[PDB]
């Protein structure tokens, strides 16, 4: 349960993540997406904490928290960050770290260091970008240790090497309410496009799931509850191997509510790719498009509560995540129903791009939003199709 202030911040974090997802989906250089609305919101909260006047008020505007005190925002966001660990077993299936990297010359304000550690658990470090290999090495080693190797490299290059770099490294592993059998795993092909396919490992399972097959919009939507039904993972996949652009037009808070109402518990034979999906996003360019124009500009930025010096701007906001799909979950009472209960299951075979969301069941807040377009795997030879499976 959330306080009414944190509950309204949660709705805006979800609406903000929907906007960031759509902005990134337009970009053709973007393949996989992985956003945690609460971690995106906390980044804006850190701008409101270290910023001043327009720089700080724009962060509250982007987060629609202008009609709330600064202390209410930092406490409400600190509350939502702690609620993430509740539905996910903290420090084992869910890991998060936040670090502000300032230039070697810049010294952080002792009051800012205390309040950012208090509300956002933010770490602070100085970094010399003259030696570009040792600056990237420090960032990647920190993100690797934060996620215990699951995210070994945040970025290969830092573009703006003259300001504050905010890095968020995460590891999330959905723990199913009903586990997959560890041996219901095999090698299948994932059609990235109609002409491109990568070799992937897949995990398979048949059970009762809330499901809807939308024949007019040609797509399936299934809800997979996570540990103790405290949150659930929703997957939207088109019927055909197509670019998700079309589904992303329909992906609105209103259509999702409609789709979820049309769902009903049916026997479903789910098959998903198994493995770690690593995604790094620099949200700086997209945050300006949402209203944060002062902080990202070297001349307009006022991060005086952060250091006590202009010429210090939000150079980058890295949102790096390692999202693992695995068989592990809670054990399920085998033979609770039987083979006649799961008789003609609906097929939900995720061998082509799909959109997914992690939703808190109690509050309805969005934990994650993303899409799996290109999983890790080598391109398969087209000539293998000349050799039929008979």
CATH topology of the largest domain: Antithrombin, Chain I, domain 2
Distance between the termini: 56 Å
Q: Tally the structural domains.
A: 2
Radius of gyration: 22 Å
- What is the CATH C level class of the largest domain, in words? Alpha Beta
Question: What pattern of helices and strands is seen along the backbone?
Answer: HEHHHEHEHEEEEEHHEHEEEE
Largest sheet: 13 strands, mixed
Number of helices: 9
Measured by DSSP, the beta-strand proportion falls in: 25-35%
The number of strands is 13
| Gross morphology | globular
Structural class: alpha+beta
Residues in helix, %: 25-40%
- The CATH superfamily title of the largest domain: Antithrombin, subunit I, domain 2
CATH architecture of the largest domain: 2-Layer Sandwich
Family: Belongs to the serpin family.
Function: Binds specifically to collagen. Could be involved as a chaperone in the biosynthetic pathway of collagen.
Subcellular location: Endoplasmic reticulum lumen
Organism: Canis lupus familiaris (Dog)
Explain how this protein is built.
- Residues 18-375 form the Serpin domain.
- Keywords: Acetylation, Chaperone, Collagen, Endoplasmic reticulum, Glycoprotein, Phosphoprotein, Signal, Stress response.
- Binds specifically to collagen. Could be involved as a chaperone in the biosynthetic pathway of collagen.
- This protein has 390 residues and is of the alpha+beta class.
- It has two domains: 3-176 and 274-342, Antithrombin, Chain I, domain 2; 177-273 and 343-380, Alpha-1-antitrypsin, domain 1, CATH 2.30.39.
- 28% of the residues lie in helices and 30% in strands.
- It has helices at 4-26, 37-50, 54-62, 70-86, 110-120, 132-146, 245-250, 253-261, 284-288, and strands at 33-35, 94-103, 122-127, 164-172, 185-191, 197-214, 219-225, 231-238, 264-282, 314-325, 346-349, 354-360, 366-372.
- Strands 1, 2, 3, 4, 5, 6, 7, 8, 9, 10, 11, 12 and 13 form a 13-stranded mixed β-sheet that branches.
- Helix 1 (4-26) crosses helix 2 and helix 2 runs antiparallel to helix 3.
- The relative contact order is 0.20.
């Amino acid at each position: 349960m959330l306080s009414p202030k944190a509950a309204t911040l949660a709705e805006r974090s979800a609406g903000l993540a929907f906007s960031l997802y759509q902005a990134m989906a337009k970009d053709q250089a973007v393949e996989n997406i992985l956003l945690s609305p609460v971690v995106v919101a906390s980044s804006l909260g850190l701008v409101s904490l270290g910023g001043k006047a327009t720089t700080a008020s724009q962060a509250k505007a982007v987060l629609s928290a202008e009609q709330l005190r600064d202390e209410e925002v930092h406490a409400g966001l600190g509350e939502l960050l702690r609620s993430l660990s509740n539905s996910t077993a903290r420090n084992v299936t869910w890991k998060l770290g936040s670090r502000l990297y300032g230039p070697s010359s810049v010294s952080f304000a002792e009051d800012f260091v205390r309040s950012s550690k208090q509300h956002y658990n933010c770490e602070h470090s100085k970094i010399n970008f003259r030696d570009k290999r040792s600056a990237l090495q420090s960032i990647n080693e920190w993100a690797a240790q934060t996620t215990d190797g699951k995210l070994p490299e945040v970025t290969k290059d830092v573009e703006r090497t003259d300001g504050a770099l905010l890095v968020n490294a995460m590891f999330f592993k959905p723990h199913w309410d009903e586990k997959f059998h560890h041996k219901m795993v095999d090698n299948r092909g994932f059609m990235v496009t109609r002409s491109y396919t990568v070799g992937v490992t897949m995990m398979h399972r048949t059970g009762l799931y809330n499901y809807y097959d939308d024949e007019k919009e040609k797509l399936q939507i299934v809800e997979m509850p996570l540990a103790h039904k405290l949150s659930s993972l929703i997957i939207l996949m088109p019927h055909h191997v197509e670019p998700l652009e079309r589904l992303e037009k329909l992906l609105t808070k209103e259509q999702l509510k409609i789709w979820m109402g049309k769902m009903q518990k049916k026997a479903v034979a789910i098959s998903l790719p198994k493995g770690v999906v690593e995604v790094t996003h620099d949200l700086q360019k997209h945050l300006a498009g949402l209203g944060l124009t002062e902080a990202i500009d070297k001349n307009k930025a006022d991060l005086s509560r952060m250091s006590g010096k202009k010429d210090l701007y939000l150079a980058s906001v890295f949102h790096a995540t390692a999202f693992e799909w695995d068989t592990e979950g809670n054990p399920f009472d085998q033979d609770i129903y039987g083979r006649e209960e799961l008789r003609s299951p609906k097929l939900f075979y995720a061998d082509h791009p799909f959109i997914f969301l992690v939703r808190d069941t109690q509050s309805g807040s969005l934990l994650f939003i993303g899409r799996l377009v290109r999983p890790k795997g080598d391109k398969m030879r087209d000539e293998l199709l000349e050799h039929h499976h008979h």
